[PDB]
């Protein structure tokens, strides 16, 4: 139902996040590269607060991408957790966790942490 | 001043954290391996709340180890952030961030996240 969220978003690197915000709170779409060829496209699914507070607070949301498609398998998954802030300069501020499948011994280097900011305007 | 904190601590892996809690709030010591030879020993420094609440809350603290000694340089630094919980089974519950120096292009894989639990008894 969140038209505010539904659409195309771009992060600082040029990656494109295309999402549809369902009235039920579902997020569905695809994540791809700057040179968005099919080989760089991956499916995403997530959830968002479909009834946010009206006091000016952002809209909490999160989504996951498993890095496997018909062209590649990076044996990993990334989750983005953050909030949508609407307005003239709408943005989705997030923090992410990228976990790679590792052997038990290598579990110490299994999870990278970072952050991304998405906007409606191409970088 | 925190005698509770001063001493030898061990995490799940066998790593040994030897620290002295200064009356001023300073933490000073060394971090080393299970087979604690000199080659595995690194200097640490940190800070802790020297006047914690008495309502049963833990004691907030944090420390840093730069992974360089006279035998090796892993070009990285780890910070542990957590709290000391005293008592019969005293423990230091932490979450850590390990950052490696990377080129600008590789900054995405610069930071690993994890957690450690330290106890007074050897694993």
């Amino acid at each position: 139902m969140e038209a505010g969220i539904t659409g195309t978003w771009y992060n600082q690197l040029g990656s494109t996040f295309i999402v549809t915000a369902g009235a039920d709170g579902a997020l569905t779409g695809t994540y791809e590269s700057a040179v968005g060829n099919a080989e760089s496209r991956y499916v995403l699914t997530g959830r968002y607060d479909s009834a946010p507070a009206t006091d000016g607070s952002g809209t909490a949301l999160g989504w996951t991408v498993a890095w496997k498609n018909n062209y590649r398998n990076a044996h990993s998954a990334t989750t983005w957790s953050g909030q949508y802030v609407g307005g003239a300069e709408a943005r989705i501020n997030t923090q992410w966790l990228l976990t790679s499948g590792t052997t038990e011994a290598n579990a110490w280097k299994s999870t990278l942490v970072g952050h991304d900011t998405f906007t409606k305007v191409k970088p | 001043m925190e005698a509770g904190i001063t001493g030898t601590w061990y995490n799940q892996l066998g790593s040994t954290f030897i620290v002295t809690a200064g009356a001023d709030g300073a933490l000073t010591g060394t971090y080393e391996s299970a087979v604690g030879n000199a080659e595995s020993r690194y200097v640490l420094t940190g800070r802790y709340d020297s006047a914690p609440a008495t309502d049963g809350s833990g004691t907030a603290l944090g420390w840093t180890v730069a992974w360089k000694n006279n035998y090796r340089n892993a070009h990285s630094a780890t910070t542990w952030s957590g709290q000391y919980v005293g008592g019969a089974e005293a423990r230091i519950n932490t979450q850590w961030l390990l950052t490696s120096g990377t080129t600008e292009a590789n900054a995405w894989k610069s930071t690993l996240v994890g957690h450690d639990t330290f106890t007074k008894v050897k694993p």
């Binding site: 040029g14 990656s15 994540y31 791809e32 590269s33 990076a74 990228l98 | -």
Partner: peptide
């Protein structure tokens, strides 16, 4: 090693 998330 690189990763599809950042080749984007």
């Amino acid at each position: 090693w690189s990763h599809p998330q950042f080749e984007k």
